[PDB]
Amino acid sequence: KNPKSDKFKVKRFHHIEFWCGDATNVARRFSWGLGMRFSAKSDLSTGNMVHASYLLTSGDLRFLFTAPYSPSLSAGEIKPTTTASIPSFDHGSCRSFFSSHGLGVRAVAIEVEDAESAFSISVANGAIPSSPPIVLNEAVTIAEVKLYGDVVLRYVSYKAEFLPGFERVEDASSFPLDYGIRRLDHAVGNVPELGPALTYVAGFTGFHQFAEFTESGLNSAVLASNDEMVLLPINEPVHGTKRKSQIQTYLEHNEGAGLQHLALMSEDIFRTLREMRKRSSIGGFDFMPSPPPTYYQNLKKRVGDVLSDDQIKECEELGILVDRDDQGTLLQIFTKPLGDRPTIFIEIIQRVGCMMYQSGGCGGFGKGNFSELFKSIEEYEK
Amino acid sequence: KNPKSDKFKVKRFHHIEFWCGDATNVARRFSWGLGMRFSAKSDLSTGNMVHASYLLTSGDLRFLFTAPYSPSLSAGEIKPTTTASIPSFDHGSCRSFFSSHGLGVRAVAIEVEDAESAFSISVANGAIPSSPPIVLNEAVTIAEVKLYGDVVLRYVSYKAEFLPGFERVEDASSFPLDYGIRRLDHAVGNVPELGPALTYVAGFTGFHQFAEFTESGLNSAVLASNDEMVLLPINEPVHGTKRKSQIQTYLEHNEGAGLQHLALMSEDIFRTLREMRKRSSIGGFDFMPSPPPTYYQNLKKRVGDVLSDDQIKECEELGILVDRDDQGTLLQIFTKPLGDRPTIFIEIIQRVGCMMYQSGGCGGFGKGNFSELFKSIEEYEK
Numbered sequence: 001k002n003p004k005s006d007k008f009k010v011k012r013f014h015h016i017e018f019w020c021g022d023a024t025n026v027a028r029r030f031s032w033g034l035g036m037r038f039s040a041k042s043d044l045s046t047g048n049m050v051h052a053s054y055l056l057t058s059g060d061l062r063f064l065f066t067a068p069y070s071p072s073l074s075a076g077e078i079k080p081t082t083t084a085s086i087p088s089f090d091h092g093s094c095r096s097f098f099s100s101h102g103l104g105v106r107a108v109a110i111e112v113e114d115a116e117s118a119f120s121i122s123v124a125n126g127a128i129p130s131s132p133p134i135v136l137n138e139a140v141t142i143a144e145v146k147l148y149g150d151v152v153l154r155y156v157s158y159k160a161e162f163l164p165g166f167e168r169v170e171d172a173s174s175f176p177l178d179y180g181i182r183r184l185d186h187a188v189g190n191v192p193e194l195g196p197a198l199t200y201v202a203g204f205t206g207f208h209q210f211a212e213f214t215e216s217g218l219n220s221a222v223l224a225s226n227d228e229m230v231l232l233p234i235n236e237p238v239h240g241t242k243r244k245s246q247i248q249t250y251l252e253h254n255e256g257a258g259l260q261h262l263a264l265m266s267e268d269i270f271r272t273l274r275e276m277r278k279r280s281s282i283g284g285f286d287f288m289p290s291p292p293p294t295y296y297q298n299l300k301k302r303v304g305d306v307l308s309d310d311q312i313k314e315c316e317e318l319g320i321l322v323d324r325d326d327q328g329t330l331l332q333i334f335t336k337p338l339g340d341r342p343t344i345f346i347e348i349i350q351r352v353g354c355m356m357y358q359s360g361g362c363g364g365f366g367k368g369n370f371s372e373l374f375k376s377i378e379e380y381e382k
Numbered sequence: 383k384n385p386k387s388d389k390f391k392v393k394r395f396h397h398i399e400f401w402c403g404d405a406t407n408v409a410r411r412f413s414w415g416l417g418m419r420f421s422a423k424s425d426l427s428t429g430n431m432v433h434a435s436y437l438l439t440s441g442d443l444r445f446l447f448t449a450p451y452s453p454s455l456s457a458g459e460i461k462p463t464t465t466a467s468i469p470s471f472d473h474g475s476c477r478s479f480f481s482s483h484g485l486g487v488r489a490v491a492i493e494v495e496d497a498e499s500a501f502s503i504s505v506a507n508g509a510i511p512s513s514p515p516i517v518l519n520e521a522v523t524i525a526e527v528k529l530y531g532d533v534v535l536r537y538v539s540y541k542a543e544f545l546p547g548f549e550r551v552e553d554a555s556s557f558p559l560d561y562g563i564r565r566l567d568h569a570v571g572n573v574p575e576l577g578p579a580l581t582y583v584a585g586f587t588g589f590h591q592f593a594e595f596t597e598s599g600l601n602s603a604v605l606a607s608n609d610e611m612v613l614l615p616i617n618e619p620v621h622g623t624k625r626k627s628q629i630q631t632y633l634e635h636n637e638g639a640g641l642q643h644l645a646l647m648s649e650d651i652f653r654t655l656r657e658m659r660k661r662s663s664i665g666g667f668d669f670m671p672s673p674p675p676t677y678y679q680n681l682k683k684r685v686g687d688v689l690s691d692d693q694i695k696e697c698e699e700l701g702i703l704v705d706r707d708d709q710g711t712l713l714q715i716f717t718k719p720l721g722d723r724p725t726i727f728i729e730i731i732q733r734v735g736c737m738m739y740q741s742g743g744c745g746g747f748g749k750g751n752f753s754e755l756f757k758s759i760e761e762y763e764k
């Protein structure tokens with residue numbers, strides 16, 4: 001059921017911000033590996049003496065890559081006089097974040113109808129504030145509250161192009177890469193305690209529970225906005241098994257709670273993963289090992305309704321996993337970690353079904369794949 | 383003249399080490415942009431709980447990319463018990479370096495005959511020590527002294543493959559990229575005072591002066607080993623001009639002295655720059671604006687001995703600059719800065735002449751190009 005209990009009007013996922021040591025090199029790496037275009041910049045060349053920020057886009061997917069300059073460049077500035085385009089940026093918070101966590105997501109940004117309203121209500125409903133609502137060039141309002149660990153939920157509202165103080169990137173350095181990725185489907189957090197984190201975040205958003213899982217590694221539950229286009233899974237470790245919890249492994253190397261992965265919807269996961277796998281070893285992203293043939297044999301038994309033999313065969317060529325709900329079918333695959341630490345990674349998905357537009361969360365999140373993976377793996381050893 | 387006054391046996395440039403926030407993302411970016419292969423790793427998967435280090439190679443060019451893990455992973459270690467493969471690494475020095483300078487070169491590594499000898503002699507001749515000589519798996523000795531700013535001159539000696547504790551990278555993730563780059567030709571430092579820096583470095587190496595310049599921006603001089611295969615230019619600002627010194631601009635954004643650029647020799651600078659320019663806007667490196675046609679007109683007057691019309695025309699297609707000595711011809715081009723700050727960049731070169739093998743420094747370093755650039759630029763405005 002859906003109680004539709006949001007405490008403010010939430011529109012959609014807007015952007016994701018990575019805090020980096022060098023924004024250029026991460027952004028250029030992500031651009032090539034994922035097929036996103038360089039579409040906006042705020043830096044020294046735009047008069048920003050505080051931080052370097054570069055935005056990649058694929059469809060409605062926006063990845064923001066931010067790093068601090070030397071504080072010496074903005075030593076004569078104060079917040080009222082700042083040249084930063086992102087007023088919540090802080091040299092010391094950025095360097096502490098990166099030093100503690102390595103490369104990772106700092107902000108999960110959602111568009112709302114009124115960022116100042118959304119901030120006040122949230123804090124009035126238990127959210128720890130992180131940056132109060134600031135109006136940019138009387139056009140855009142932004143505000144931040146704590147989500148989990150050092151990750152912030154960022155509210156954005158527009159009166160009526162990315163942010164003031166950003167510039168459209170010169171056509172020549174903006175090469176129209178595109179491998180089929182269109183928007184952010186969901187963002188998954190890992191915490192030491194799922195209960196308090198669910199209570200906290202549902203407390204100040206009014207987001208409702210969408211799904212849950214539990215017997216191998218984790219417990220999780222998903223919060224969702226009213227129309228369930230903003231989807232926030234949260235995991236916790238389950239201590240006590242033959243294998244160490246990967247959630248727990250995450251928390252160690254990340255120095256605590258943080259964002260685990262971003263699931264990016266592709267309008268054509270076949271072309272997307274062909275393009276990504278072509279580039280895996282020339283600067284792109286690597287992919288988790290592909291399931292055994294066993295798996296893909298059992299898929300004709302599970303989704304032969306949904307995917308032809310040839311489409312199943314293409315799933316096998318590319319290591320794609322398939323789960324099915326009572327309502328939809330989910331094609332999914334995972335990258336290896338995006339940086340040095342085994343912390344953040346990326347998932348590519350495409351959903352089949354739930355036509356009415358397509359309703360969010362169609363097909364679930366893969367909870368059936370745990371079983372079928374081990375079940376198929378027993379059968380490959382044979 | 384060459385007094386051949388080195389105080390220890392120096393062989394060649396061995397490797398360059400970048401200190402990074404995330405080693406993976408810089409290394410993958412550099413690999414694609416420059417056409418270097420992933421050939422060795424030391425990280426969690428090799429049992430290194432301290433740092434992540436990835437080595438790219440093109441010919442004899444070795445780029446090392448290093449970043450710290452969370453200190454929490456190695457909290458129970460001490461130097462005698464360390465899992466670091468590079469014993470001079472220090473979590474706190476790395477984070478301070480990167481926070482002060484951004485992405486940049488930490489170590490300029492040269493192979494010597496005896497690293498322990500080279501360290502003792504150097505310190506006995508005025509070098510500030512940075513890391514004392516350490517023997518790795520009774521096979522390799524490494525030692526570090528201060529070069530300028532927070533850059534260290536690293537001595538390496540081998541009894542008789544990169545470093546112990548590193549592993550050859552799996553063939554699949556090692557894609558045989560190659561755009562023609564073969565070795566490091568020279569590494570250029572910027573300092574506030576050229577005099578004391580030349581005195582310091584020549585003092586402890588015995589390197590001799592090879593060349594010098596001065597009237598627009600800088601003064602410089604080059605130190606060279608006995609056979610002049612190790613070449614170390616050093617620049618200082620010249621304050622007082624219509625345009626601000628780019629050396630001075632470097633020192634501001636870098637927070638002091640440091641390495642300005644690395645000149646990489648290509649066995650075919652035409653193919654190299656074709657390959658690099660193809661990738662400039664899809665994750666590679668950008669190039670400084672190309673000289674005007676004026677320039678390339680005057681080149682037939684200057685190197686028509688050396689380059690045919692068609693080769694000059696290919697130079698023009700790719701923005702290559704050409705200088706000529708009394709002894710050789712130099713083709714050169716410069717990238718834009720490698721990261722967020724206008725600090726470190728890269729130069730691609732190829733030298734024609736001085737055949738005997740080719741003698742180092744053949745053709746100089748471009749000091750004639752200052753004049754011919756402005757001279758040609760006056761003639762394009764016309």
Ligand SMILES: O=Cc1ccc(O)cc1
Nearest residue numbers: 211212213220233365367
């Ligand atoms: O994030 C993984 C996940 C799997 C199954 C769920 O029900 C929820 C989340």
Ligand SMILES: O=Cc1ccc(O)cc1
Nearest residue numbers: 593594595602615747749
């Ligand atoms: O590094 C640039 C340079 C130019 C001319 C010189 O003589 C020496 C260095």
Ligand SMILES: [Co+2]
Nearest residue numbers: 188263347365
């Ligand atoms: Co998921």
Ligand SMILES: [Co+2]
Nearest residue numbers: 570645729747
């Ligand atoms: Co040079």
